[PDB]
Amino acid sequence: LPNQTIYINNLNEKIKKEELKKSLYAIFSQFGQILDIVALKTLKMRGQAFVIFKEIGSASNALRTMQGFPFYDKPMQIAYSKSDSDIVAKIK
């Protein structure tokens, strides 16, 4: 069940999404190449993001290392994404 995409919850909703994405890119760049970041201002993605790494091993290290990190003063809740179909349903 590890996969290349991490799912993050409990993100600070007061942060503008462009800034949120830039900061997510910066903090997660230590783990691997990031192919994309998804963080939309929708109810379905409220307080949430996906970070897609090129390599599964990078996603695993990011999950283990950054679990509970106080990002914009809120501890991140990280998991592997449930499925690619779940990602698609979230952004729809």
């Binding site: 994405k21 830039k22 900061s23 890119y25 910066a26 903090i27 760049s29 230590q30 190449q33 990031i34 192919l35 994309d36 970041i37 990190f69 106080p70 990002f71 914009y72 003063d73």
Partner: protein, 175 residues
């Protein structure tokens, strides 16, 4: 291991990244020294030197376009002075996982006029006493430090603290 050469630059991934900026990927090569970056011809908004073997942040050529430097997981212990003359538009410097030891080692960054984001996570300096307060005071333009905002109240508090006699002594010993 390979050195940073024009050949390496030419073969490396050059692309538009997830935040829509032009990025050069130099990750993972155990590059020991910054050199030959002039060969980029100022094409990049972001240069990613993560997972190399750098001991110094130095030797940057004039690159007005450069806005983000990713330096994760090197061995950096020294930053050269006057780099704002080379990359004046640097907005973010990500130094996560390096070896910067003391607050005084950060003084070379003070000259950057639009440096709004710094990460010094997993560097010994980021656990020193008065770290966040010192950064707010020494870098008044800074907005985001280790992915926590420097808030208005944080700015004011730092300024008021370093105005006091006790605060001035803290500053004196930091030097």
């Amino acid at each position: 291991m390979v050195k940073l050469t024009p050949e390496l630059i030419n073969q490396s991934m050059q692309y538009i990244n997830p935040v829509r900026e032009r990025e050069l990927d130099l990750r993972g090569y155990k590059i020991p020294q910054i050199e030959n970056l002039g060969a980029t011809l100022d094409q990049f908004d972001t240069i990613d030197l993560s997972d190399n073997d750098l001991r110094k942040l130095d030797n940057l050529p004039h690159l007005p376009r450069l806005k983000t430097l990713l330096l994760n997981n090197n061995r950096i212990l020294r930053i050269s002075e006057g780099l704002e003359e080379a990359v004046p538009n640097l907005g973010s410097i990500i130094l996560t996982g390096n070896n910067l030891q003391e607050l005084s080692d950060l003084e070379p960054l003070v000259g950057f006029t639009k440096l709004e984001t710094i990460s010094l996570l997993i560097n010994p300096v980021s656990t020193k006493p008065n770290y966040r307060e010192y950064m707010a005071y020494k870098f008044p333009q800074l907005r985001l430090l280790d992915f926590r905002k420097i808030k208005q109240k944080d700015r004011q508090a730092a300024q008021e603290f370093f105005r006091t006699k006790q605060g001035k002594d803290v500053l004196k010993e930091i030097s």
